[PDB]
């Protein structure tokens, strides 16, 4: 089977350096080119590099061309990109693929159809220091039809608390917020459903928002200033 | 790729051919110490390392079995015991973009004295002493992976150089990495010598009409003398016949 | 880098129909042979991306044939003969020829459904959420469509840009419709000194901006 | 018929042979591996090469690590045992290979008769037909007449 692994990321404070390394297998190493292309979690695919069967790389992307430094390990099959100043568009998802075409793709590596894919680094560029969570339940409009509710971990950190409803019993119809930036740096997110409109007047709400790193659940409250 | 990621091509099973180097293709430097060029094609060697990169041109006139240098004992090693061949071509417009190719860059200041042929595709961070660096250079350690000059017309110390520098090892099994016979045309009503894959003879060697078979090779008669053999390229039955003698 | 564009980047395609996508590069890609390298390629949330159709034209392996690619030089556009919810997503296109490759700003292509009622809700802080320094409100967007919906934010005759981010959602197919969250942070200084807090977001099937106006916490 | 498997150890510590024969393919490997005794039914590795009315001949030897595989194919129509009759026999595979072999043993596959013969150094004479084939022989050891 083929399951290119992908790695070298992690906590990266902007201003470091490392060796992104991807394992590949399925093929021939020192003659077939693996490409970095980076895909940033919400970003779309671009492109950073290459390597060939004579280890023929090529360049790098618009604003990272020169920091980044290619070299390969053909023995074991292994690829590391030199890493230089990681920040907001130099982070990503570091896939590694391989182009189908065979020697001499024409001048040019075989570079185009890579349609096989590995996994991606987790490059992140966030790192500060820490204090305990807080939530604020959300409530619908002030008012047998439709509505939206969840609570808000906000002002935590770090990802992820999960968030769900008594035991996961009225979750259907989910969308989960992501994480927001606030001045001093901590997290926020949610789990609104759509459900029918029981929020305010007869029910005084609970949701399940679990600390997950510390293996720990709250079955919090949930109910507007009332 | 640039040298600091040379490539290591274990290669074999090919032609062993010079003239592609010189004169069948005009590419910049064949260079080498001990064996010579004329005899690459003729001799079989079992395996070669081929050494396959881009280095700058300003160091090519640094290898050498010794000549040190920034390329020579810092981003690829030539020792003495150079049993093979350098093959380097100009790549002006091949490795130097006019926008800048920041991609074949150099391993400038190696951590440690190059091994003999090192792997130097080594490129991390250049080694001062025991500081655990937050990855940032201080104050004793440069960029070892510094980018060139990256101009279409490259200076007298940044010029674009490919390299293949084959050393031969022939210690094991032969992969017979080498041209074949130099087989030419064939001859007929004419005494000729004759070696048709190890028989060495002497005659006159004309068309017949015996069939063999398909495994069959040689032919011979009451006194085991060779009388029959086939062309090796091709189908085809050839008869032997002594060149004539006699007295006078 | 290379100046990479699609078009059109949004356009809202039901499912079954075709849908052209195109693609501006910068940097040439004419080997001496009449050589188009710019593949087209679809990226989804979740899974492994989509190589579409590799050298321009030649449908590409392990997607459905359905893409059609036409164009020349630097300009390439796809067709997609009839997308559906597998097909539809996020689009790009790659090349291979002269670095640095810069791509385009990936055209989202999604499921278009027929005007729909919106459901405008907002979510005033509760009871723990006045005195502590921050008192956030979300304006959320539910079973609406289409998926462009502006948003202003009205105190006092001024706007809230900066101190409100937002966040948005994936699709409910069940009706086609998606979620808009603009979140407003406010410190307790200056949150409770005034009272109206208007968060006006314009539907498209009801065209007045959808106007909910909050005193406070409720 | 179609299994063969050649050795002396026979626990995957040296090089065991094994040529087989799959519905579209013909295998050969030396590698050291104990795999099953039985393939089924439908209805190291140094070297490894990959694509009653029938008699099939098969001489096997080896000399200097080179084992020679000479085979015949032939029709007949008989099922009692083989009848008495001569034919040639043709050589078909060598193998440069360079191993030590002690044993062998056949292999087969579940939803009968087969023969085998040892050879010893003899002394041959033969008659080579105006064509090239061994049409007749005699031996030099068998009785008076035939010296
Ligand atoms: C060698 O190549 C020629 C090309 O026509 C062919 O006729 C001949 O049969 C070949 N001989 C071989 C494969 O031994
Ligand atoms: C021997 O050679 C001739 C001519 O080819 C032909 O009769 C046939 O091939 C053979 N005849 C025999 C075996 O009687």
Same mark, same amino acid.
Request: charged share 20%; with cysteine.
């Given at each position: ?14 201003? =470091?350096?490392? =060796? ?8 021939? *190493? ?26 023929? !790389? ?8 020169? =920091? ?22 130099? !982070? ?31 490059? !992140? ?51 989960? *917020? ?49 | ?248 | ?218 | ?147």
């Amino acid at each position: 089977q083929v399951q290119l692994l992908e790695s070298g990321g992690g906590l990266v404070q902007p201003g =470091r350096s490392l =060796r992104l390394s991807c394992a590949a297998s399925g093929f021939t *190493f020192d003659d077939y080119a693996m490409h970095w292309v980076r895909q940033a979690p919400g970003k779309g695919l671009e492109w950073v590099s290459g390597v060939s069967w004579n280890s023929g !790389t090529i360049g790098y992307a618009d604003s990272v061309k020169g =920091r980044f430094t290619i070299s390969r390990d053909n023995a074991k099959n292994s690829l590391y990109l030199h890493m230089r100043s990681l920040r907001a568009e130099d !982070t990503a998802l570091y896939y590694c693929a391989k182009a189908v075409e065979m020697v001499r793709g024409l001048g040019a590596d075989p570079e185009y159809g890579m349609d096989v894919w590995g996994q991606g680094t987790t490059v !992140t560029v966030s790192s500060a220091s820490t204090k305990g969570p807080s939530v604020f339940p959300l409530a619908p409009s002030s008012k047998g039809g439709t509505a939206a509710l969840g609570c808000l971990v906000k002002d935590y950190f770090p990802e992820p608390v999960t968030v769900s409803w008594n035991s996961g019993a009225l979750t259907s119809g989910v969308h989960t *917020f992501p994480a927001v930036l606030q001045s001093s740096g901590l997290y926020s997110l949610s789990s609104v459903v759509t459900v029918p409109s029981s929020s305010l007047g007869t029910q005084t709400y609970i949701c399940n928002v679990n600390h997950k790193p510390s293996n720990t659940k709250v079955d919090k409250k949930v109910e507007p200033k009332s | 790729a640039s040298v600091y990621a040379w490539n290591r091509k274990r290669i074999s099973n090919c032609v062993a051919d010079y003239s592609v180097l010189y004169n069948s293709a005009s590419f910049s430097t064949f260079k080498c110490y001990g064996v010579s060029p004329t005899k690459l094609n003729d001799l079989c060697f079992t395996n070669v390392y081929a050494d396959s990169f881009v280095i700058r041109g300003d160091e090519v006139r640094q290898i050498a079995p010794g000549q040190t240098g920034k390329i020579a004992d810092y981003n690829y090693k030539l020792p003495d015991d150079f049993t093979g061949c350098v093959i380097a071509w100009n790549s002006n417009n091949l490795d130097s973009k006019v926008g800048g190719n920041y991609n074949y860059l150099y391993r400038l200041f190696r951590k440690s004295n190059l091994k003999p042929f090192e792997r130097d595709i080594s490129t991390e961070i250049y080694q001062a002493g025991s500081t655990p660096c937050n990855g940032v250079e201080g104050f004793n350690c440069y960029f070892p992976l510094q980018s060139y000059g990256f101009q279409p017309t490259n200076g007298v110390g940044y010029q674009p150089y490919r390299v293949v520098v084959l050393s031969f090892e022939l210690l094991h099994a032969p992969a017979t990495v080498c041209g074949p016979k130099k087989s030419t045309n064939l001859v007929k009503n004419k005494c000729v010598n004759f070696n048709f894959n190890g028989l060495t003879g002497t005659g006159v060697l004309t068309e017949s009409n015996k069939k063999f078979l398909p495994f069959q090779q040689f032919g011979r008669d009451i006194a085991d003398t060779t009388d029959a053999v086939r062309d090796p390229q091709t189908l085809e039955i050839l008869d032997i016949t002594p060149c004539s003698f006699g007295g006078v | 880098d290379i100046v990479m564009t699609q078009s059109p980047l949004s356009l809202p395609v039901t499912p079954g129909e075709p849908a052209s996508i195109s693609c501006r590069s910068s940097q040439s890609l004419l080997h001496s042979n009449g050589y188009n390298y710019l593949d087209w390629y679809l990226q989804k949330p979740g899974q492994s991306p989509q190589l579409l159709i590799y050298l321009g034209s030649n449908r590409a392996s392990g997607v459905p044939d359905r893409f059609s690619g036409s164009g020349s030089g630097t300009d390439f556009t796809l067709k997609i003969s009839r997308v559906e919810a597998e097909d539809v997503g996020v689009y790009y296109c790659m090349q291979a020829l002269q670095t640095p490759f810069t791509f385009g700003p990936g055209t989202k292509v999604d499921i278009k459904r027929t005007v729909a009622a919106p459901s405008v809700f907002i979510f005033p802080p509760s009871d723990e959420q006045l005195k502590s320094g921050t008192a956030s409100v979300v304006c959320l967007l539910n079973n609406f469509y289409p998926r462009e919906a502006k948003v202003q934010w009205k105190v006092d005759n001024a706007l809230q840009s900066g101190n409100s981010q937002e966040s948005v959602t994936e699709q409910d197919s069940k009706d086609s419709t998606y979620s808009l969250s603009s979140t407003l942070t406010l410190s307790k200084a200056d949150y409770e000194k005034h009272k109206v807090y208007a968060c006006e977001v314009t539907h498209q099937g009801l065209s007045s901006p959808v106007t909910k106006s909050f005193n406070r916490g409720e | 018929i179609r299994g063969w498997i050649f050795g002396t150890t026979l626990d995957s510590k040296t090089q065991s042979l094994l040529i087989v024969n799959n519905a579209t393919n013909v295998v050969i490997k030396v590698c050291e591996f104990q795999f099953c005794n039985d393939p089924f039914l439908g209805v190291n590795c140094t070297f490894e090469y990959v694509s009653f009315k029938n008699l099939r001949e098969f001489v096997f030897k080896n000399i200097d690590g080179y084992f020679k595989i000479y085979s015949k194919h032939t029709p007949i129509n008989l099922v009692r045992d083989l009848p008495q009759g001569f034919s040639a026999l043709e050589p078909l595979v060598d193998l440069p290979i360079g191993i030590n072999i002690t044993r062998f043993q056949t292999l087969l596959a579940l939803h009968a008769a087969y023969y085998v013969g040892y050879l010893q150094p003899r002394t041959f004479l033969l008659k080579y037909n105006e064509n090239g084939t061994i049409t007749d022989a005699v031996d030099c050891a068998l009785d008076p007449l035939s010296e």
